[PDB]
């Protein structure tokens, strides 16, 4: 950003809020096989931070399919506002998140 070169296909003006939101959020689930596969394509040992946070490479410039594969296992009532705000900043389809959250809350909280 200091270099002032927005010619790259990767955006820079929006990732600062994403990093803060990811730092403020704590992951509750073990890493999914998608993260293992993406890390083993560019082989590097997974650090311990995979147990507490979400990978930035698969979120920012990754596909929305990866987005919904990763946030599928992270759905909860407390995580719903943070993930909804992230999806607002992702400019993705909020309706899929709403349907998935409704089904998850029905199954985990309303069913018992």
Curated annotation (Swiss-Prot):
High expression in testis. It is found in: Cytoplasm; Nucleus; Chromosome, Centromere, Kinetochore; Cytoplasm, Cytoskeleton, Spindle. It comes from the Eukaryota. Signal peptide: none annotated. Interacts with ZW10; the interaction is required for stable association with the kinetochore. Component of the RZZ complex composed of KNTC1/ROD, ZW10 and ZWILCH; in the complex interacts directly with ZWILCH. Essential component of the mitotic checkpoint, which prevents cells from prematurely exiting mitosis. Required for the assembly of the dynein-dynactin and MAD1-MAD2 complexes onto kinetochores. Its function related to the spindle assembly machinery is proposed to depend on its association in the mitotic RZZ complex. This is Kinetochore-associated protein 1. It comes from Homo sapiens (Human).
């Amino acid at each position: 950003e200091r270099a002032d070169e927005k010619i790259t296909n990767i955006n820079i003006n929006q990732a600062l809020s994403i990093l803060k939101h990811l730092k403020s959020y704590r992951r509750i689930s073990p890493p999914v096989d998608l993260e293992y596969q993406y890390m083993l394509e560019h082989v590097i040992t997974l650090p311990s931070a995979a147990q507490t946070r979400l990978p930035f490479h698969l979120i920012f410039f990754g596909t929305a399919q990866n987005f919904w594969k990763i946030l599928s296992t992270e759905l909860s009532e407390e995580s719903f506002p943070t993930l909804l705000l992230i999806s607002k900043l992702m400019k993705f389809s909020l309706d899929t998140l709403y349907v998935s959250t409704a089904k998850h809350v029905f199954e985990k909280k309303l069913k018992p």
